[PDB]
Amino acid sequence: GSSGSSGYVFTVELERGPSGLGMGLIDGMHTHLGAPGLYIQTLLPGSPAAADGRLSLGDRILEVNGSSLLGLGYLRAVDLIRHGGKKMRFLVAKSDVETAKKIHSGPSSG
Template sequence: MSAGARAAVEEIALTRGPSGLGFNIIGGTDQQYIAHDSGIYVSSIKEKGAAAADGRLQEGDQILEVNGFKMEDLLHNAAVDLFRNAGENVLLKVRHKVLNQQNGPSGNRSERDSEDSSLAMLAIPVLLSVAVVAIFAFVKYRQRM
């Protein structure tokens, strides 16, 4: 990918299996996954689902369209309903997550792109820090009993 290039966009056709399409989503206008971004993102891939068998969809990918319907400005539940009612054969348009984006050349990235990727990269360490503090507090509390 050249300097300043955006993440790759790909169309992925999936056939609904016994466990549905085999992935979960996060995001929407009411549950923003990334600050100032109401996009719909893949939060997890189910091991034996259709998405895992295909192998191209990854956690962190943004779902841009489902069967030609743009996933813009939707409430989370509306996006979930769209997936549930998409039929057996589903065509997704996906923007793949950029790996190691913070280490690459910044090129023409906008200030918002930089802020969004930084916030996404901070989410996991912050959650881990909160978990460690909670465990430490619980252990200290138990020692006092």
């Protein structure tokens, strides 16, 4: 298939664990996606992000603790989450599988 058009967004309220959450976010630029913005790459086992379930690999973050992540340098974003708080909020959008594929082994061998 192909699929297109955006869908719906969903918030994620977690509590900064003893490991500081557990969301292997990476710059879309680093991932095959080659697109700007942060995206879920992994989901630690003993983490709240994972314990959540919703958070899926490839997911794309939008906000962090009510902090618009539109232009915020990867570092800045990482910092936000890093220096987050007891209550960590994230605005991720329900992306497709393909989106993740690019994040983790995209199409076309190579």
